[PDB]
Design a protein around this nucleic acid. Structure first.
Ligand SMILES: [Mg+2]
Ligand SMILES: [Mg+2]
Ligand SMILES: [Mg+2]
Ligand SMILES: [Mg+2]
Ligand SMILES: [Mg+2]
Ligand SMILES: [Mg+2]
Ligand SMILES: [Mg+2]
Ligand SMILES: [Mg+2]
Ligand SMILES: [Mg+2]
Lengths: 51, 82, 119, 67
RNA sequence: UUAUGCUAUCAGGUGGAUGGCUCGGCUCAAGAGCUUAUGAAGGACGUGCCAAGCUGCGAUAAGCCCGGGGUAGGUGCAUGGAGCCAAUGAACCCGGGAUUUCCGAAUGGGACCUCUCCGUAGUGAUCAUUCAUGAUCGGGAACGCUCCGAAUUGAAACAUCUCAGUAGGAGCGGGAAAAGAAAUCAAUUGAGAUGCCGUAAGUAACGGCGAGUGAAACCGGCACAGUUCAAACCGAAUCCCUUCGGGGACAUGUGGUGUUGUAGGGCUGUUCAAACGUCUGGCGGUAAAAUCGAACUUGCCUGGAACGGCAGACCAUAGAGUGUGACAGUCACUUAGAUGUACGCCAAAAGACCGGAACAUGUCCCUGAGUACCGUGCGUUGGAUAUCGUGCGUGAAU
RNA sequence: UGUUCGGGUCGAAGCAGGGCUGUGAAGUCCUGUGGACCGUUCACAAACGAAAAUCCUGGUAAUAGUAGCAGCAAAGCAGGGUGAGACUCCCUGCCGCCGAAGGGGCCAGGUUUCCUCGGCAAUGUUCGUCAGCCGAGGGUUAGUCGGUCCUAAGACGUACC
């Protein structure tokens, strides 16, 4: 099941945390000028090269 | 360095408190001995054992089992979890 | 202080846009009334919350009032009386520019204010 | 003003400074514990003020050779 | 009410051209120019009340402390909610400190394991000494020095030649580097260290004498500066470390004299006396954020709003420019012209320090070796029997 | 760009359509839109004029409501619910498929796809109230299971050259 070390799991946790919708108050404050970031992906697509 | 950040207060952590246990979020670069000594100095309760977990958010949870009964209840009372 | 070697529009607008926040206090400058200028010797001054201004340009030529707030980053002040209404109806302050106002009553509470005005 | 200024931190004794440090750490632990359960804090300026005050106290101790 | 259609114009959709604007780019000029074992550049992970990215920062984590400048607000790109901080002088700017996870020159051992093992808490490798201690390692846009080194292409094919000592590689290295005080260039008799620019000149020279390659000296400028060892004579008279007790180097030579060609120096005798340079000194200059800096916001018209039109009043050692509800010398910041400045740097008077310049005398003594030259092979060069290098062999005088 | 004379919020550039002038390159004026800049005399410059390069970039037609949504596993029907909306989501009954693989255990690989609640613009070869989709929250506990330990093929480091 892909036995991982500590560092690999750490990087996987970070790449997980980056999949987030931009906060609503950011969109309110910037006046609909920020609506996305380049860190969004999906698990069944291009594999991440984190490991 | 400080190894205890704050108690963890989800629904699962509340039920552990029934049979005299807590669940802290500890510093991810620490082992069981350091956790033991920090908690013992900070509350003066003789810990019995300790179980550790690494979560997918990054942090590191630790479950402390105390020897003296009713200790976890009053620790959670003074800490403010209650 | 940016000498005559800054005659390029790009440089001037860079200087005014990305300014240190202690230089943006200077852009809050407004003319003084006759008595103020002839008793302090400075032709102008800076606008600070708590002083009475007289609007000189725009839709409210001649209306007076206190300064209700100042924002350094925006570069605009807020004045009593000068308001705008919402569609549902709610009076709101309308921002102005300190170069369209005249100072008639200074608000002396800092103690350092007199030295700050001149020298 | 602040939870403590530098004058009061430098004026106190060693044990007084240490005790203030433990009080601040305990209050920070409680504040984080409450906020960790997805709740709007009763006063969400406390965390920043507390951390900055603790930074002041540790800086003062390290300057006075206390630690 | 002739359907499905054809041509032209109009209204709307889609789309994002044109115009106007622009905190961006590019080129030239003037400055300034090293940093790291006291742990760099770069990377991973973390850090915000609501926080995903970038930016900053490091478990003291969009930050802490001190001094100055600045004055009423602050909470990055990014004016949302709720809070906090600030007259005990914040935010911001200039200078100086503190904390500074793990990897990384990475350096106690080990890495398809940015973590892990023993903890004997860790001087990894190579070096110098008096063996206390000290030095090197990595990075840097291009520039710099040494060594190794192609082919396409041109010759209307192609091999010498050319492309070209170019592209590329290895080593070393600073704010610059390299060179540098004639065993020189000249021509009849002269010049007087080096570098860089101009010219000589597409000339001399090389070459299937084809295509092509290709200098220097004289002369004009920028800038100027000369010296130190080895030996002859004396023989420890010298140097360094230090707990100030002492210890190491050194007769296989520390130190003094001496440094050159119409020869010089030493030995021997006379004379004149002290030029260049090192140190202390800080008169006086340069010098952070920064401070001051003239004169309209006057009347009527248009307009949502005057910096505009028509009238009137002023400034100028300031009519460069930007902002402001439309075109601004007089509204704001500026400008011309003046003041101020900690840490540093430069430096004039004035004192102390080693001391230098000539002459006369000679079977007197000293002046850089596998070097200079030469034979032979190859590379390179404009270098031609007359460039430089260096493999082998041979090889002087004083 | 240098220089001379000007226009513009009582409406500049640009755009759509028209009138007149010139052999022509083109100029000027009118109407609608637009909301801030644009010319001219004498000269000088150039990153200076496009219909074509199986040209480059962007937008968009016909083909066309067409092919495909069959071939190796032809699978659904009745009754009752939920819901604005039901061939397609849920329960019961009947009828079916694999049954030495389409079941169970797990390596490498994936990296939150796992569980609950709330949604249906897009994703799903149709619809959808459903979902491996979208939003919020939660979940992995070891002296005995593995790694860690030993060495094989064979690597790497320091020294010597
Ligand atoms: Mg040829
Ligand atoms: Mg180096
Ligand atoms: Mg030399
Ligand atoms: Mg050549
Ligand atoms: Mg001016
Ligand atoms: Mg075309
Ligand atoms: Mg069967
Ligand atoms: Mg669908
Ligand atoms: Mg475990």
């Amino acid at each position: 099941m892909s036995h991982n070390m500590k560092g690999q799991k750490k990087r996987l946790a970070k790449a997980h945390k980056q999949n987030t919708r931009v906060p609503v108050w950011v969109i309110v404050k910037t006046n609909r000028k920020v609506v996305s970031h380049p860190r969004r992906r999906h698990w069944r697509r291009r594999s991440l090269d984190v490991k | 360095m400080s190894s205890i950040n704050y108690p963890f207060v989800t629904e699962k952590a509340m039920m552990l408190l029934d049979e005299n246990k807590l669940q802290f979020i500890v510093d991810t670069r620490s082992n069981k001995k350091q956790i033991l000594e920090d908690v013992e100095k900070m509350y003066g309760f003789k810990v019995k054992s300790v179980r550790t977990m690494t979560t997918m958010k990054g942090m590191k949870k630790a479950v402390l089992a105390f020897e003296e009964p009713e200790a976890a209840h009053e620790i959670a009372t003074r800490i403010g979890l209650m | 202080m940016i000498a005559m070697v800054s005659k390029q529009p790009r440089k001037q607008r860079k200087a005014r846009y990305a300014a240190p926040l202690h230089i943006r206090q200077k852009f809050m400058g407004a003319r003084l009334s006759e008595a103020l200028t002839k008793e302090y010797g400075t032709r102008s001054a800076a606008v600070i919350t708590g002083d009475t201004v007289k609007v000189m340009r725009g839709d409210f030529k001649g209306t007076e009032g206190k300064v209700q707030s100042v924002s350094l980053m925006d570069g605009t002040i807020t004045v009593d009386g000068v308001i705008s209404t919402k569609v549902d109806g709610t009076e709101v302050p309308r921002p102005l520019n300190p170069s369209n106002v005249m100072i008639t009553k200074l608000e002396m509470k800092d103690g350092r204010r007199a030295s700050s005005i001149k020298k | 003003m602040a939870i403590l200024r530098t004058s009061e931190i430098r004026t106190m004794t060693i044990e007084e400074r240490a005790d203030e440090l433990e009080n601040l750490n305990n209050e920070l632990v409680r504040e984080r514990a409450l906020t960790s359960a997805g709740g709007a804090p009763e006063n969400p300026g406390r965390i920043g003020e507390i951390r900055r005050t603790i930074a002041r106290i540790k800086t003062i101790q390290h300057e006075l050779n206390e630690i």
